């Protein structure tokens, strides 16, 4: 069947001199597998699934290095966006980024994502063609022109269509007994994956619940 | 795994 791997980043500015928050979370479908928190002593990408714990220190070392780079990038982004919108230093602001890939039943690239939101409103997004951008407003046109001239979509297409898919495939094989699992709603209770046809809620045991 | 590449908006 169809699977996906997604990365969700939130970064929240704090009034004045307070350093900002940064949350990195990773999912393979409806199962979270990794986390990185700014307000955590560890300062390391941490496993949130059993199957990812089998990975070597090199993996965890790299994932920590790459998230600290993303974190520093989004910290700069908060400062940039305040300027783009001509905002003050006392009011709290949020930057959200998501990226990832969907694979079909043959575990082959289906579709890719790469989008940002600022204060809960869409800011910029890579289109389904993975060549062009959707700039919500005049502030986001400064971003689109920078990313076009510097050929970002081509590099992002490379990761999404290839690397991203290869990782999704490695996780699916490693997490065999967890991710490839199909449940089985009761009449809708204790089913997996979450997609079904009140909002679908996590039972907290890996499965979900729904009401008619 | 995540991107090894970072860029500012």
């Amino acid at each position, epitope marked *: 069947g169809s699977h996906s791997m997604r990365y969700f980043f939130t970064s929240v500015s704090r009034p004045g001199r307070g350093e900002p928050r940064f949350i990195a979370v990773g999912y393979v479908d409806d199962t979270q597998f990794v986390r990185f928190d700014s307000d955590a002593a560890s300062q390391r990408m941490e496993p949130r699934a059993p199957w990812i714990e089998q990975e070597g220190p090199e993996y965890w070392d790299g994932e920590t*290095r790459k998230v600290k780079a993303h974190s520093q990038t989004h910290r*700069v982004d908060l400062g940039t966006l305040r300027g783009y919108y001509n905002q003050s230093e006392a009011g709290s602001h949020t930057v959200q980024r998501m990226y990832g890939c969907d694979v079909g039943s043959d575990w082959r690239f289906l579709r890719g994502y790469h989008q940002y939101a600022y204060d809960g409103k869409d800011y910029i997004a890579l289109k389904e063609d993975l060549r062009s951008w959707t700039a919500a407003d005049m502030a986001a046109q400064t971003t689109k022109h920078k990313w076009e001239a510097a050929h970002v979509a081509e590099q992002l297409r490379a990761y999404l269509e290839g690397t991203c898919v290869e990782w999704l495939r490695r996780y699916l094989e490693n997490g065999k007994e967890t991710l490839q699992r199909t449940d089985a709603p009761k009449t809708a209770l204790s089913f997996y994956p979450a997609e079904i046809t009140v909002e679908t809620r996590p039972a907290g045991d890996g499965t979900f619940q729904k009401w008619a | 795994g995540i991107l090894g590449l970072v860029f500012t908006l």
Partner: T-cell receptor
Amino acid sequence: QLLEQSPQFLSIQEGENLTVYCNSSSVFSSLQWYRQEPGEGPVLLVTVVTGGEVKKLKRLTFQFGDARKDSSLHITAAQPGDTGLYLCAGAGSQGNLIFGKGTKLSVKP
Amino acid sequence: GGITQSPKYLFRKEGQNVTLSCEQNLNHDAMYWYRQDPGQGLRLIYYSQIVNDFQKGDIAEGYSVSREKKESFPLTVTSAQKNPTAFYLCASSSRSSYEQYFGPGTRLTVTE
């Protein structure tokens, strides 16, 4: 990611037309060419992004291969002022450029 | 704008720690340090994709870097660097992985 440059050395004659190669097995999202004189900073000649794309700068013609795994550097009517190390580089997955070892070109009078 | 590396020539007795300057007013997010031996290619030492983050290149042993400001990317040649005499080159790019713009280079010669 790896970039292989051929030939390592080329010693041609002033007036001759030559071609230097830069190949990989992996696709590169963008590619660069440089020229470096000894003990001086490399000068960027071009950036190629589209496969099949041909660009021209001074007496140089660059061509990015269709699959984007290779590029060539053609010099028309070479002058002794084309002497130097030619370096190709490509977009690195880890936030850097992937460099080839180069072609040392000597244009003899 | 431009990329500068001063001075052109650096001279030090073995055992001394030395700082190689690299500055740019090009508004480039990423900076790089390479070394090149005579009749040889470029070798990546250290690099920074964004301010407050750095990462090791292929030859990072005995070197150290700082990225406190978008504009500077100082390289320290430490006593632990076995073969320190080389031509050192700094470069910057708008964003990492894009076309790099090289500084003029610094020739460092370390003496017995």
